[PDB]
Amino acid sequence: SALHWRAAGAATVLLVIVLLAGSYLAVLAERGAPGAQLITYPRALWWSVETATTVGYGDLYPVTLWGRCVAVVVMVAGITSFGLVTAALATWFVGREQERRGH
Amino acid sequence: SALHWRAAGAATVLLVIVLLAGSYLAVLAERGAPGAQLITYPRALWWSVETATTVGYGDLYPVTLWGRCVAVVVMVAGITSFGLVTAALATWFVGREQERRGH
Amino acid sequence: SALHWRAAGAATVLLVIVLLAGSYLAVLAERGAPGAQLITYPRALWWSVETATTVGYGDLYPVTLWGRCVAVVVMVAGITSFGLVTAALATWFVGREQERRGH
Amino acid sequence: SALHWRAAGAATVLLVIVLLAGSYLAVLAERGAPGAQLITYPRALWWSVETATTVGYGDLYPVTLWGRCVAVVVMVAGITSFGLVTAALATWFVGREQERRGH
Amino acid sequence: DILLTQSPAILSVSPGERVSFSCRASQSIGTDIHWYQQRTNGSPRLLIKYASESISGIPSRFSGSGSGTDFTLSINSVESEDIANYYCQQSNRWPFTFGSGTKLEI
Amino acid sequence: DILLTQSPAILSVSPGERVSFSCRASQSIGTDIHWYQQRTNGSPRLLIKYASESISGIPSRFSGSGSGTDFTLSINSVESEDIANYYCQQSNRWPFTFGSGTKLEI
Numbered sequence: 210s211a212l213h214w215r216a217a218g219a220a221t222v223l224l225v226i227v228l229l230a231g232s233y234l235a236v237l238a239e240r241g242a243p244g245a246q247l248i249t250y251p252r253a254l255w256w257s258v259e260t261a262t263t264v265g266y267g268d269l270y271p272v273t274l275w276g277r278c279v280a281v282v283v284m285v286a287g288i289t290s291f292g293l294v295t296a297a298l299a300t301w302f303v304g305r306e307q308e309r310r311g312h
Numbered sequence: 313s314a315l316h317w318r319a320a321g322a323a324t325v326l327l328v329i330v331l332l333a334g335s336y337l338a339v340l341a342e343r344g345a346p347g348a349q350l351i352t353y354p355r356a357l358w359w360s361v362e363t364a365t366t367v368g369y370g371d372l373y374p375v376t377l378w379g380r381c382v383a384v385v386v387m388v389a390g391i392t393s394f395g396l397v398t399a400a401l402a403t404w405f406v407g408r409e410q411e412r413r414g415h
Numbered sequence: 416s417a418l419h420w421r422a423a424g425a426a427t428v429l430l431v432i433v434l435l436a437g438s439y440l441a442v443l444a445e446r447g448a449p450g451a452q453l454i455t456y457p458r459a460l461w462w463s464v465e466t467a468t469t470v471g472y473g474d475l476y477p478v479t480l481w482g483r484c485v486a487v488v489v490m491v492a493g494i495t496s497f498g499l500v501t502a503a504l505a506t507w508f509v510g511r512e513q514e515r516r517g518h
Numbered sequence: 519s520a521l522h523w524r525a526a527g528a529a530t531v532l533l534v535i536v537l538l539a540g541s542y543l544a545v546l547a548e549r550g551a552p553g554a555q556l557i558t559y560p561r562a563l564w565w566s567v568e569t570a571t572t573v574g575y576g577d578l579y580p581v582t583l584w585g586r587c588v589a590v591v592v593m594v595a596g597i598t599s600f601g602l603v604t605a606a607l608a609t610w611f612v613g614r615e616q617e618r619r620g621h
Numbered sequence: 622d623i624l625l626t627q628s629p630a631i632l633s634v635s636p637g638e639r640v641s642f643s644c645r646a647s648q649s650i651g652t653d654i655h656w657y658q659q660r661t662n663g664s665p666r667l668l669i670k671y672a673s674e675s676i677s678g679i680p681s682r683f684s685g686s687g688s689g690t691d692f693t694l695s696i697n698s699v700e701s702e703d704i705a706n707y708y709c710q711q712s713n714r715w716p717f718t719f720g721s722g723t724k725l726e727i
Numbered sequence: 728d729i730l731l732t733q734s735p736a737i738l739s740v741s742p743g744e745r746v747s748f749s750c751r752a753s754q755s756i757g758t759d760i761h762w763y764q765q766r767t768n769g770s771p772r773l774l775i776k777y778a779s780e781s782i783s784g785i786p787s788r789f790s791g792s793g794s795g796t797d798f799t800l801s802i803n804s805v806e807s808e809d810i811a812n813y814y815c816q817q818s819n820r821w822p823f824t825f826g827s828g829t830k831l832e833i
């Protein structure tokens with residue numbers, strides 16, 4: 210083990226769960242709002258990933274309050290996750306560089 | 313305490329303030345510009361978050377000079393904040409890894 | 416050498432490959448789906464970069480399942496890569512700061 | 519001084535230059551392409567920032583080859599810059615945490 | 622600016638019948654339409670908001686529907702107290718605009 | 728809400744000929760159109776989904792095409808068992824809406 214790598218794993222699992230519950234809850238929240246486009250499950254999972262990577266194109270987006278809530282949670286999950294890998298990569302690199310220098 | 317975690321907290325509080333003043337000022341700046349879409353408070357707060365996470369979909373965006381100024385401030389707040397957590401996560405991980413190694 | 420810089424290089428090479436195979440496979444997957452816009456090679460490479468930087472504008476995006484798969488791979492490649500440079504930059508800075516302090 | 523903070527400064531200056539030359543060259547490249555929307559200076563600077571923060575909404579985007587080249591340069595400048603601050607923030611935090619621990 | 626088009630300008634209905642007023646946008650505005658009522662000599666009276674959300678204090682027989690460019694205010698069982706002018710209003714894009722109005726007549 | 732427009736309402740064809748039913752959307756809906764069949768006294772019967780994806784259990788002579796706003800269900804060689812009403816349905820934007828229907832007649 211090692212904490213940093215253990216958090217990355219955790220964060221991935223978590224992410225995969227967040228952006229599934231995400232899809233489900235997005236559809237659940239968005240159906241009922243006239244004109245809402247984010248209303249079938251499959252494409253709504255693709256919206257989840259898209260959103261979590263902050264690449265948001267605008268083919269799909271939530272229009273209701275709770276959709277947008279779910280949205281916000283997905284975004285932060287996406288960022289937190291991906292940042293917590295970058296952090297974990299530095300931790301690793303920094304550990305190694307100290308060996309190269311004999312520290 | 314610990315500086316890194318104290319800055320993260322700070323940055324969150326700050327962010328929440330930036331993307332509220334953001335919404336308010338966005339509406340204030342955008343009303344008066346014909347065709348502007350970013351002109352009610354609630355949705356304009358959703359624009360704030362969206363923007364700060366860099367996920368910008370394009371359901372909403374500022375069209376005036378000052379809207380776009382406010383926009384720029386929100387973006388940087390969003391990024392700074394989220395980066396300052398990633399930094400804080402590495403700081404933490406790096407602190408820990410040194411214990412595992414008995415350093 | 417030095418690991419951190421060696422990973423950055425690696426990650427760049429990898430990225431350049433991912434977002435070429437990306438373009439190719441995107442076109443391959445998207446042609447055949449009525450209304451699909453992501454169907455010529457040149458612009459589809461521009462879609463690749465756009466996507467990998469998470470700047471996704473929405474001039475172009477995949478509409479099929481496999482397009483979106485390819486998409487997901489490109490995004491993660493883009494992020495992983497760019498994060499693995501930030502990590503490598505900290506590793507470097509952190510190495511240096513310790514010299515300034517005579518550590 | 520301190521390297522990490524000196525690079526952040528540098529990167530900011532650089533960024534400000536990249537996303538000005540960016541605007542200028544974007545207009546220069548895009549005028550002449552029928553239907554191109556990215557063709558006046560002011561809004562094209564707003565496109566620059568938007569793009570560099572990866573928040574790309576899709577109110578504006580390059581359509582020509584060289585526009586898209588310029589685009590790619592702006593994106594990478596934006597990311598590199600903002601990552602090089604996050605790196606610099608960790609470097610700082612990590613320096614400090616070691617004092618708290620008396621290292 | 623957004624042009625709202627209320628047709629027909631007059632609506633003649635027998636008491637109790639179901640009635641429907643139309644409002645059309647010059648371009649897609651989502652659900653940012655709002656309905657007001659104005660009785661002779663009276664001020665406007667918010668009836669329905671965002672096309673279908675009801676307002677507290679308004680008869681249950683008032684409802685609304687639509688999205689994008691075509692929107693409809695309905696009254697299930699019409700009656701004397703409904704005789705009024707009916708305007709719709711959009712808040713999608715700036716200026717903020719009203720419909721020409723239509724008059725209900727029993 | 729999305730308006731689906733099936734014209735013409737009736738289709739008269741000689742046995743075996745190729746036949747084509749039209750369905751038009753009030754606004755671009757991609758390929759989120761679906762085709763149902765209803766024989767006299769019968770329940771609807773999913774024929775084609777997302778405009779062109781075939782359904783297991785449906786004659787090979789059934790096909791479909793189109794994208795955006797204009798969509799078409801076709802039958803290569805028509806025959807008695809095809810005499811029915813044909814409806815299309817969209818799942819692009821919420822409400823979910825049907826077409827007025829068209830009747831095939833040999």
Ligand SMILES: CC[As+](CC)(CC)CC
Nearest residue numbers: 266267370473575576577
């Ligand atoms: C303004 C972004 As778009 C409409 C949401 C993305 C499909 C048009 C480029």
Ligand SMILES: [Co+2]
Nearest residue numbers: 312415518621
């Ligand atoms: Co030491």
Ligand SMILES: [Tl+]
Nearest residue numbers: 263366469572
């Ligand atoms: Tl982004």
Ligand SMILES: [Tl+]
Nearest residue numbers: 263366469572
């Ligand atoms: Tl983005």
Ligand SMILES: [Tl+]
Nearest residue numbers: 266369472575
């Ligand atoms: Tl976008």
Ligand SMILES: [Tl+]
Nearest residue numbers: 292395498601
């Ligand atoms: Tl980032």
